[PDB]
């Protein structure tokens, strides 16, 4: 009974699978040219240092699982097949921990490296996923104290690794303020200012055209030299009612502000999401309980919620009301139906811990944990401890 609670819990101890995910996050406000020189520097490392395992790397930029923007990129790393890389160091768990330690040399990006779980339709990352379901009832962007707890104050990792954001930090933006009084007092109407600023920078889409027998689109935008700087805001002209051109900086100024490039709504409140894995050596249940000493530091209103592939750990958990409490409950009935007694079906279920006493020992000695394969293994050993009992108690009860 003590050794049952001494073992930790998990769910599907995952496999190599030859695949590896790696996302980058340059600091906010970075261009795509700054992201590309990190993505290519990550790409060249895996093809000469880790050529024993890595077969081919496919890097996209502008998009990862955390979000989208010019400050985001990711890599699908497909490894060698199972017979071309022998040795336990060529596993993805020993490639990931030695590539993640190398990625701390890259200074201008929070580069990560992780594996998906054993199931692929469920989850895209091994380890826990917890959402900061922050039910404080506050206004929609006065909830920045949830972010303040989300940065490092929920990242006090005693035995975790690669605890990472899944949103992204807020960045500077350029608020373009146009006064309609002065602009209208020079004759130029405001709808033309709206159409000019929406076509020149916003890449309007006018209608469709056809080439090679396929219908495609025709877009309309200013040239790249005219939309790079705030001073390039002052290069565009609008025609007033008298028919002459007013510059754009005669009635419009600019001012820097600070805003988030990604906004969510999770179960009625905008949450922030945290991904992370357990350290090499321990299971997933003690990691999901080792974040419970981190969640006890929390402000008002917020809470933690397990979801995704971590929803089953806290909705299934241990099925002590149902699993191996109503399974072997009915075998006492179905053996009373065949033994025609009260005490001799009790005797053959009395010997049931003598099978699980080594079923716990084998997973304790190999270092595994309590997962669903361990549960269905125990559900065989109940029947195994029963079939040795019944085969030698049937002859004991017929001969009497």
């Amino acid at each position: 009974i003590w050794m049952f609670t001494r073992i930790p819990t998990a769910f599907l101890p995952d496999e190599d699978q030859g695949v590896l995910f790696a996302q980058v996050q340059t600091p906010p406000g970075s261009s795509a040219e700054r992201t590309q020189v990190v993505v290519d520097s990550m790409r060249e490392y895996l093809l000469e240092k880790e050529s024993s395992s890595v077969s081919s790397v496919f890097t996209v930029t502008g998009f990862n699982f955390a979000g989208r923007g010019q400050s985001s990129g990711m890599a699908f790393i497909m490894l060698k097949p199972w017979e071309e890389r022998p040795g336990g160091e060529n596993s993805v768990f020993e490639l990931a921990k030695r590539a993640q330690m190398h990625f701390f040399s890259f200074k201008d990006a929070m580069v990560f490296a992780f594996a998906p779980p054993s199931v692929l339709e469920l989850g895209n990352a091994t380890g826990f996923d917890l959402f900061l379901q922050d039910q404080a009832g506050v206004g929609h962007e006065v909830l920045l104290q949830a972010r303040n707890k989300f940065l490092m104050l929920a990242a006090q990792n005693p035995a975790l690794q690669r605890v990472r954001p899944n949103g992204m930090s807020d960045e500077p933006q350029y608020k373009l303020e146009i006064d309609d009084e002065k602009a209208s007092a020079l004759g130029v109407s405001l709808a033309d200012i709206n159409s000019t600023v929406s076509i020149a920078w916003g890449s309007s889409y006018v209608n469709d055209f056809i080439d090679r027998g396929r219908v495609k689109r025709v877009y309309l935008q200013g040239r790249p030299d005219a939309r790079m700087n705030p001073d390039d805001l002052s290069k565009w002209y609008v025609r007033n009612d008298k028919g002459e051109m007013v510059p754009f900086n005669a009635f419009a100024t600019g001012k820097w502000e600070y805003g988030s490039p990604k906004l969510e709504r999770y179960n009625g409140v905008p949450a922030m999401e945290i991904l992370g894995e357990p350290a090499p050596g321990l299971s997933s249940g003690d990691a999901m309980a080792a974040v419970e000493e981190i969640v006890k530091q929390l402000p008002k209103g917020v809470g933690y919620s397990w979801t995704g592939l971590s929803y089953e750990e806290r909705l299934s958990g241990s099925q002590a009301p149902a699993l191996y409490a109503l399974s072997l409950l009915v075998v006492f009935l179905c053996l009373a139906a065949l033994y025609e007694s009260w005490s001799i079906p009790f005797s053959v279920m009395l010997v049931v811990p003598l099978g699980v006493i080594g079923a716990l020992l084998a997973t304790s000695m190999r270092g595994l944990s309590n997962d669903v394969f361990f549960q269905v293994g125990l559900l065989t050993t109940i029947g195994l401890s029963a079939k040795n009992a019944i085969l030698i108690v049937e002859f004991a009860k017929e001969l009497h």
């Binding site: 001799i344 006493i357 080594g358 195994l384 040795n388």
Partner: peptide, 28 residues
Amino acid sequence: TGVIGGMVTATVLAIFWVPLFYVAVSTL
């Protein structure tokens, strides 16, 4: 491993205790 280690102790123990528990004296 959970079924190998579960079966070996279900064999080398229960052959001593299932005859010990059929002869439980409450079955008068």
